[PDB]
Design an enzyme around this catalytic site. Structure first.
Site, PDB file in Angstrom:
ATOM      1  N   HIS A 114       0.758  -1.245   0.000  1.00  0.00           N
ATOM      2  CA  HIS A 114       0.000   0.000   0.000  1.00  0.00           C
ATOM      3  C   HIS A 114       0.797   1.308   0.000  1.00  0.00           C
ATOM      4  CE1 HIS A 114      -3.746  -2.260   0.758  1.00  0.00           C
ATOM      5  NE2 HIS A 114      -2.977  -3.032   1.505  1.00  0.00           N
TER       6      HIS A 114
ATOM      7  N   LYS B 205      -9.078  13.462   4.567  1.00  0.00           N
ATOM      8  CA  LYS B 205      -8.220  12.283   4.559  1.00  0.00           C
ATOM      9  C   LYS B 205      -7.246  12.491   5.721  1.00  0.00           C
ATOM     10  CE  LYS B 205      -6.339  13.408   0.394  1.00  0.00           C
ATOM     11  NZ  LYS B 205      -7.116  12.368  -0.345  1.00  0.00           N
ATOM     12  N   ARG B 206      -6.514  11.451   6.104  1.00  0.00           N
ATOM     13  CA  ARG B 206      -5.568  11.587   7.208  1.00  0.00           C
ATOM     14  C   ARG B 206      -4.539  12.673   6.888  1.00  0.00           C
ATOM     15  NH1 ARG B 206      -5.534   7.414  11.347  1.00  0.00           N
ATOM     16  NH2 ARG B 206      -3.601   8.450  12.017  1.00  0.00           N
TER      17      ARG B 206
ATOM     18  N   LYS C 122       0.354  14.101   1.428  1.00  0.00           N
ATOM     19  CA  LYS C 122      -0.984  14.388   0.898  1.00  0.00           C
ATOM     20  C   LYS C 122      -1.125  15.887   0.610  1.00  0.00           C
ATOM     21  CE  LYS C 122      -3.204  10.434   3.201  1.00  0.00           C
ATOM     22  NZ  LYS C 122      -3.917   9.790   2.055  1.00  0.00           N
TER      23      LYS C 122
ATOM     24  N   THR D 280      -8.671   6.258  -2.242  1.00  0.00           N
ATOM     25  CA  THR D 280      -9.994   5.668  -2.450  1.00  0.00           C
ATOM     26  C   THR D 280     -11.030   6.757  -2.211  1.00  0.00           C
ATOM     27  OG1 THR D 280     -10.004   4.851  -0.157  1.00  0.00           O
ATOM     28  CG2 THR D 280      -9.419   3.275  -1.902  1.00  0.00           C
TER      29      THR D 280
ATOM     30  N   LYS E 195     -14.766   7.909  -4.111  1.00  0.00           N
ATOM     31  CA  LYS E 195     -16.037   8.218  -3.455  1.00  0.00           C
ATOM     32  C   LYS E 195     -16.606   9.562  -3.935  1.00  0.00           C
ATOM     33  CE  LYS E 195     -14.035   5.990   0.590  1.00  0.00           C
ATOM     34  NZ  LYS E 195     -13.552   6.274   1.934  1.00  0.00           N
TER      35      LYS E 195
HETATM   36  O1  LIG Z   1      -4.081   3.620   4.776  1.00  0.00           O
HETATM   37  C1  LIG Z   1      -2.925   3.207   4.540  1.00  0.00           C
HETATM   38  N1  LIG Z   1      -2.107   2.793   5.523  1.00  0.00           N
HETATM   39  C2  LIG Z   1      -2.398   2.775   6.867  1.00  0.00           C
HETATM   40  O2  LIG Z   1      -3.490   3.171   7.339  1.00  0.00           O
HETATM   41  C3  LIG Z   1      -1.343   2.225   7.791  1.00  0.00           C
HETATM   42  C4  LIG Z   1      -1.719   1.735   9.117  1.00  0.00           C
HETATM   43  C5  LIG Z   1      -0.705   1.192  10.006  1.00  0.00           C
HETATM   44  C6  LIG Z   1       0.675   1.133   9.583  1.00  0.00           C
HETATM   45  O3  LIG Z   1       1.605   0.608  10.447  1.00  0.00           O
HETATM   46  C7  LIG Z   1       1.066   1.617   8.274  1.00  0.00           C
HETATM   47  C8  LIG Z   1       0.046   2.165   7.377  1.00  0.00           C
HETATM   48  N2  LIG Z   1      -2.487   3.158   3.282  1.00  0.00           N
HETATM   49  C9  LIG Z   1      -3.378   3.585   2.246  1.00  0.00           C
HETATM   50  O4  LIG Z   1      -4.102   2.358   1.717  1.00  0.00           O
HETATM   51  C10 LIG Z   1      -5.091   2.699   0.675  1.00  0.00           C
HETATM   52  C11 LIG Z   1      -5.810   1.396   0.187  1.00  0.00           C
HETATM   53  O5  LIG Z   1      -4.882   0.616  -0.628  1.00  0.00           O
HETATM   54  C12 LIG Z   1      -4.423   3.418  -0.518  1.00  0.00           C
HETATM   55  O6  LIG Z   1      -5.459   3.770  -1.503  1.00  0.00           O
HETATM   56  C13 LIG Z   1      -3.686   4.658  -0.059  1.00  0.00           C
HETATM   57  O7  LIG Z   1      -3.047   5.266  -1.221  1.00  0.00           O
HETATM   58  C14 LIG Z   1      -2.607   4.234   1.026  1.00  0.00           C
HETATM   59  O8  LIG Z   1      -1.903   5.365   1.498  1.00  0.00           O
HETATM   60  C1  LIG Z   2     -12.240   6.556   2.080  1.00  0.00           C
HETATM   61  C2  LIG Z   2     -11.652   6.964   3.483  1.00  0.00           C
HETATM   62  C3  LIG Z   2     -10.278   7.213   3.660  1.00  0.00           C
HETATM   63  C4  LIG Z   2      -9.247   7.146   2.525  1.00  0.00           C
HETATM   64  O1  LIG Z   2      -9.186   8.412   1.924  1.00  0.00           O
HETATM   65  P1  LIG Z   2      -7.987   8.850   0.918  1.00  0.00           P
HETATM   66  O2  LIG Z   2      -8.340  10.224   0.539  1.00  0.00           O
HETATM   67  O3  LIG Z   2      -7.869   7.853  -0.150  1.00  0.00           O
HETATM   68  O4  LIG Z   2      -6.696   8.915   1.782  1.00  0.00           O
HETATM   69  C5  LIG Z   2      -9.822   7.632   4.855  1.00  0.00           C
HETATM   70  N1  LIG Z   2     -10.672   7.825   5.897  1.00  0.00           N
HETATM   71  C6  LIG Z   2     -12.004   7.584   5.771  1.00  0.00           C
HETATM   72  C7  LIG Z   2     -12.881   7.682   7.010  1.00  0.00           C
HETATM   73  C8  LIG Z   2     -12.513   7.148   4.563  1.00  0.00           C
HETATM   74  O5  LIG Z   2     -13.899   6.968   4.431  1.00  0.00           O
END
Ligand SMILES: O=C(NC(=O)c1ccc(O)cc1)N[C@@H]1O[C@H](CO)[C@@H](O)[C@H](O)[C@H]1O
Ligand SMILES: *Cc1c(COP(=O)(O)O)cnc(C)c1O
Ligand SMILES: O=C(NC(=O)c1ccc(O)cc1)N[C@@H]1O[C@H](CO)[C@@H](O)[C@H](O)[C@H]1O
Ligand SMILES: O=c1[nH]cnc2c1ncn2[C@@H]1O[C@H](COP(=O)(O)O)[C@@H](O)[C@H]1O
Ligand SMILES: O=c1[nH]cnc2c1ncn2[C@@H]1O[C@H](COP(=O)(O)O)[C@@H](O)[C@H]1O
Ligand SMILES: *Cc1c(COP(=O)(O)O)cnc(C)c1O
Lengths: 805, 805
Positions: B346, B537-538, B543, B645, B649
């Protein structure tokens, strides 16, 4: 068996469909994958459904009628299992038995799956449980308030003859009887400081712990009344990141485990937090309900009963709220407090009395300490006025005890702040007035009362001994179940050959039933024809399980002496848990198992003598062994057992009693007649004369050959070959510092036991004496006890009137 | 609204009676004392009942048919609320809406009471949630396995413009959707030592922690399929007394809280324990099911998908079981393992990759470390044979990384032990092969795949935007809900005056609905006629919420420059949580609120510009704000956002997108047409050329006057009067060490934003472009994604066939 209710066709049909509905929707299971435990839960939820309607309207009723409310505060509620008791009180036993039978299930097998709610140590906790049942049966608007311990009394494992403690994870599979009420969570404060500003004191900078209530229904006996037992659980407020969340535990540990020390008081901080926690949360509930009904009428609408001094902080907490929050003047608040609270004492032994170090209260509850000092100041000013110049009385009656470290005597606090103080047996109540609380009695005689203990006939007769309940009902009806005094009608059957035969038959059936159980879940075989000699209760030196041990060894030695001489066969059973840090108690358990290892494997003894230690004694086991007992051992040193309640359970179930004139034993013998009781040993007066003189155990050792032989056997390692000095501590204690005079009652005890064996040889006369005991056990129903508390202390009238639903 | 199912007369009648049945028997309440929360729970249990029958037979079906099972392992499952989603998938929404309406209740009000199941951080956790929905909808025998955290992602509070973390006690009032399965508890081992005896290695002297499963139903979209998500909870085994019981917590802390660090890897022991805990318990379940169906067929009956490297220990754990317990020879076990496991990556950012210190694995999992060394040894022997003499490749590809402290690269372990490795967007998958995993790609090209992410159209369209779903269904039917590609049929309506009007109407209604919510639960007022510019988003530097901030300040300065010049009104909303220990991320949040404090209170600006920070962004809030957005901000530096993602949405809900050619943005623009997307900034190639040259921010500061003014404002304390140097760290980072080149895309970003405002001034053309986006969003349905995983990785065929019940 008629006393189990009717098994109506449409009632059975309804139960069956609700059983399968819960198995599907509630448990989410296939009948092809359901296990016995799943079936138990389906049955439990089915029975629980029947309680709901009654529970909701009972509480609704109290809101309407607004009667005086009784609040029973206890840190212990030894409930045991709930399923059968609920069926019994709702008259659903036969119906459920038929419904399950038709589903191809054995209800008895399912009942054994339920865990015991072991939120108590023994007598005190079980009394609270019997009291809840009686208050519901007598229609009182009563509430039981305590703590929902995640871990109750430890499960006892015997390894190598030693006690091992195992956590009692009773909530692992869930508790179908309780209903969490998170919406009614309340704040409890700790630590902090006391600000003294213009208008009154202020307790600030406190740490908050939330109290979340869980309610459990308490059904009355077929009167449609269902009261509530509300138990508080500790929760941390939501306001390194990871460590902060993990530290929430610290606050939640308050309701994690039941303290198992029922012998020696330990001023541990966690225990004090538990005591305030239950008191602070409960009092907010009480006041809330009151304001929804002028605190002048508070005592007319509220009664708070303190089960021992454990919840004694209720007194200064009520004062804190009335004075600091409601703004009442001291004198007015004190008047209300005294008229609301009542205190029950359960022991005269000094080591068990709560005496909290001032430095602990000073840090944890600064405002309460100030309030206690003020109470003390005003109380002593009263004493000084009544007994001018008696400076010694002042130091003796003070709530604050000087010395090494200053401590607060919680019993003195309870007497000062209660309008009633009671003992739990006539002899105990008298001893309180003549010794321990003499000064207080002289100051306020009107406060001292007696309320002899009792046991509920539902759980302790109908539930655990249906056979006996049935043969009794056949002859006098079923009215006695809620009016135990009717058992006196059985004296007219003492010469009835039919009844004599039935009484003896049920006892024999219970013994075979228990003997079978002993092999099934414990693989030990016993002779059902032998006299079942049993002593089950917590292990304490004052209860003298040791004296019983000396008799067993005496019997063994006599047999080895004259092997071909006939002796009445006996199965001696001793069971009970020892407090974790009570060394001597743990040594006594080891002694009992060690004696068994020798006696049970001696070819010469045969099946004439067996010594078994009943592992993990608890309420569910008591329900099995008591109905099977022939002889009840109640042999505490005169003046030490406040009342005892196990003694009452044995009397109601057809066992004869061998005991000292201690606690309730005195009243039991008075009711049944001394000729129908096996009384022996020193009376309280004898014990005091011996103390005046000075107890010297060596004297008995020198004059009694049989006793000397036993001591020498213990010392030489006869019962501990690999470890010759294993019991050196026991011998040393018996010979040089036995506070309970075991040797002093040995001769009379042995002689009395011989008279027991003599009577057992005459089946017909033994049974007739049994009938005379059962017939006069009526006074010991907790319904009688509760009626007295209601009329003489709480100011309310009991009611046997069925409720509207 | 027809897409909510039919509201049959007897269906509504049934729901009503079951609602009242649960309120009475389940909740044990009076209608006279029930609160909105009580009503929510009664509704939840009522809906849950409808899932049971289907759930039981679905699982029964898998037992019968014995299809290949898919196990999705993730440490995160960001589920959000469950009530409405369940109604939607069971076609009970209109019926429940009518039933509650008749009971005098507002179902929307009740839905807001449910807590979110926030067991995830963001994208990765939410992907797992969308995947579960799609797998159930496509009829796959799939199981989601994770941890039941007692505390999910923290609730975010904004105090003084700063983020404050509050524990997420989501289970306080209970979770009606889950079913505890204590009877299926399993042992998980930790620590210990490895004995090497005659026949194989032995892991002994371990400490045991029990894993208790809780099952939650996962309903497919109107196909009667209900799969399971099994989450493990940690329990201590039952085998000073008080302290021993209190210490049980230590073992139970494993499942206490979700780690919130989604930016920087921290090798904390507790996190490693969580990772092994889920893997060890899950694998026992997998093998159990398998043996109840020769491990040669194991890969034909089991597929394990690893969501990132978090559950990577599954590889050596499967080897441990096969070799140490089942006694298979290494080569055979390895073959089975590789054919069973697949890994999804990811992110390419180095700081997020898991690299565990060897000394940690050495102490906690000694046998696994040995297995990893053996895997490494054999893998490197393969590399050496394929690339003879390339010693540098050997060090680069090793699973063990040398240096300060030895570490295990979990990504390398996953590639070696998986038959498939995939990126989550075409550009991301390509970058993996060209850079980070280039060496592995050259060794085994066949393992590398792409599986572009997707989102479920149930929750992200039907549930959160019924208005749009309805107007779409009116014209093309409802088939698109489970076949999103059908939305392409909407291109024939791009010139339809009626449709254009409806699309614009629903968006306007959603904006008024959200604007109202903003005032109700947050008391902030916004202009519904302004362009809703949102970035949720986070918070991460990559970002680039900071770039958005620079544009906002630019807009503000331009207005202060020419106050009476017309500008398209905008409401800029930014929301998202920052990892607790991510200093820069917390400073950016403060910067956003500080900008708002200035802009929102400037009389000259009026209602032409508003800056709002959306507090506590989570799934339930995303469902509210996304349908109300006009402009979606997806502005990560090219090559940093693996996929994204949230972007999908927004596209599905009628918002236009301004973003870089990063992650899935590339494919979204390809599907809708670049002319219908607002693309700007450097492409990945541009970023690399800049790095070759060397990024010097000072250059942009010197050449762009508007940018210089902003930096000077930040430095001088214009946005922090009381604390002039408050943002010194931000300026310092932007000017000297910005890994994400914020200044490099500033000019193109601002210009692109002007073109956005220009289009918004033409309502009709803006809406037509919106229709072209919605119409081509079909590819981004997670049903498409799951179908590809099924066919290209797991080896199973998806099925849209309704189930028999
Ligand atoms: O959200 C994360 N990662 C974490 O939340 C995370 C949680 C604990 C960790 O130790 C490292 C990363 N990655 C996100 O996963 C999405 C689904 O594939 C991608 O669309 C985003 O581009 C990517 O940044
Ligand atoms: C869809 C979703 C995300 C992922 O958002 P990105 O803009 O792809 O980082 C994060 N948090 C919540 C609560 C979501 O619904
Ligand atoms: O059981 C107890 N006491 C405890 O269990 C106990 C528990 C915690 C403590 O800190 C002190 C005592 N007392 C018992 O309460 C019974 C009911 O009144 C009496 O009949 C017994 O004679 C008395 O010993
Ligand atoms: O304000 C009220 N209105 C109506 N009934 C009430 C009210 N407060 C309590 N009750 C009823 O009284 C019962 C007692 O609640 P409790 O004693 O406060 O726990 C409730 O379940 C209701 O049936
Ligand atoms: O031995 C068995 N006999 C009959 N049904 C079974 C058996 N084992 C599992 N099942 C069914 O399969 C479902 C799957 O259970 P699980 O996958 O092991 O959690 C169970 O709820 C049962 O319906
Ligand atoms: C009745 C009871 C007690 C009290 O017994 P005594 O002999 O009065 O000390 C203790 N434990 C259990 C489980 C009981 O049922």
């Amino acid at each position: 068996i008629s006393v189990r209710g009717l098994a109506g066709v449409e009632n059975v049909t309804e139960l069956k469909k609700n059983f399968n509905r819960h198995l599907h929707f509630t448990l989410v299971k296939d009948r092809n994958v359901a296990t016995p435990r799943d079936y138990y839960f389906a049955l439990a939820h089915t029975v629980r459904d029947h309680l709901v309607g009654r529970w909701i309207r009972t509480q609704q009723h109290y809101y309407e009628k607004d009667p005086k409310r009784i609040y029973y505060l206890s840190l212990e509620f030894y409930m045991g299992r709930t399923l059968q008791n609920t069926m019994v009180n709702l008259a659903l036993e036969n119906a459920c038995d038929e419904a399950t039978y038709q589903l191809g299930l054995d209800m008895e097998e399912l009942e054994e799956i339920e865990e015991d709610a072991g939120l108590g140590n023994g007598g005190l906790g079980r009394l609270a449980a019997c009291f809840l049942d009686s208050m519901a049966t007598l229609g009182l608007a009563a509430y039981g308030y305590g703590i929902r311990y995640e871990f109750g009394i430890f499960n006892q494992k015997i390894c190598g003859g030693w006690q091992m403690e195992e956590a009692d994870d009773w909530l692992r599979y869930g508790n179908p009887w309780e209903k969490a009420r998170p919406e009614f969570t309340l704040p409890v404060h700790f630590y902090g400081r006391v600000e003294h500003t213009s208008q009154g004191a202020k307790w600030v900078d406190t740490q908050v712990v939330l109290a979340m209530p869980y309610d459990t229904p308490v059904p009355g006996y077929r009167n449609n009344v269902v009261n509530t037992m509300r138990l508080w659980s500790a929760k941390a407020p939501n306001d390194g990141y990871i460590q902060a969340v993990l530290d929430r535990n610290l606050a939640e540990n308050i309701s994690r485990v039941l303290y198992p020390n029922d012998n020696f008081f330990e001023g541990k901080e966690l225990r004090l937090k538990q005591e305030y926690f239950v008191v602070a949360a409960t009092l907010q509930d009480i006041i809330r309900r009151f304001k929804s009904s002028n605190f002048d009428a508070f005592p007319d609408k509220v009664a708070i009963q303190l089960n021992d001094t454990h919840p004694s902080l209720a007194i200064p907490e009520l004062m804190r709220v009335l004075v600091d929050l409601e703004r009442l003047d001291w004198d007015k608040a004190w008047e209300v407090t005294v008229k609301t609270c009542a205190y029950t004492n359960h022991t005269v032994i000094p080591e068990a009395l709560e005496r909290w170090p001032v430095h602990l209260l000073e840090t944890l509850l600064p405002r309460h300490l100030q309030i206690i000092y003020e109470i003390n100041q005003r109380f002593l000013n009263r004493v000084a006025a009544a007994f001018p110049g008696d400076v010694d009385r002042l130091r003796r009656m003070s709530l604050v005890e000087e010395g090494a470290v200053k401590r607060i005597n919680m019993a003195h606090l309870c007497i000062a702040g209660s309008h009633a103080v009671n003992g739990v047996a006539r002899i105990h109540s008298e001893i309180l007035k003549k010794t321990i609380f003499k000064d207080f009695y002289e100051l306020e005689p009107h406060k001292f009362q007696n309320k002899t203990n009792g046991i509920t006939p539902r759980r302790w007769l109908v539930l655990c001994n249906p056979g006996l309940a049935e043969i009794i009902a056949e002859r006098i009806g079923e009215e006695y179940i809620s009016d135990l005094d009717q058992l006196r009608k059985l004296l007219s059957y003492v010469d009835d050959e039919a009844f004599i035969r039935d009484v003896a038959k049920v006892k024999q059936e219970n013994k075979l039933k228990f003997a079978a159980y002993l092999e099934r879940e414990y693989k030990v075989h016993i002779n059902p024809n032998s006299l079942f000699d049993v002593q089950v209760k917590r292990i304490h030196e004052y209860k003298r399980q040791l004296l019983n041990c000396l008799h067993v060894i005496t019997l063994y030695n006599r047999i080895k002496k004259e092997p071909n001489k006939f002796v009445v066969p006996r199965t001696v059973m001793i069971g009970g848990k020892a407090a974790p840090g009570y060394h001597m108690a743990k040594m006594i358990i080891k002694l009992i198992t060690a004696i068994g290892d020798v006696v049970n494997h001696d070819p010469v003894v045969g099946d004439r003598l067996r010594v078994i230690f009943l592992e993990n004694y608890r309420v569910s086991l008591a329900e099995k062994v008591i109905p099977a007992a022939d002889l009840s051992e109640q042999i505490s040193t005169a003046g030490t057992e406040a009342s005892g309640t196990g003694n009452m359970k044995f009397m109601l179930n057809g066992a004869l009693t061998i005991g000292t004139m201690d606690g309730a034993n005195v009243e039991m013998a008075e009711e049944a007649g001394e000729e129908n009781f096996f009384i022996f040993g020193m009376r309280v007066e004898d014990v005091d004369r011996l103390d005046q003189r000075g107890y010297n155990a060596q004297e008995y050792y020198d004059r009694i050959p049989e006793l000397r032989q036993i001591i020498e056997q213990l010392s030489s390692g006869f019962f501990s070959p690999k470890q010759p000095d294993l019991f050196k501590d026991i011998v040393n204690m018996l010979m040089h510092h036995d506070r309970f005079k075991v040797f002093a009652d040995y001769e009379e005890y042995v002689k009395c036991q011989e008279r027991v064996s003599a009577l057992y040889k005459n089946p017909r006369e033994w049974t007739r004496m049994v009938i005379r005991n059962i017939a006069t056990s009526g006074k010991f129903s907790s319904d009688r006890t509760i009626a007295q508390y209601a009329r003489e202390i709480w100011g309310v009238e009991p009611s046997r009137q069925r409720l509207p639903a």
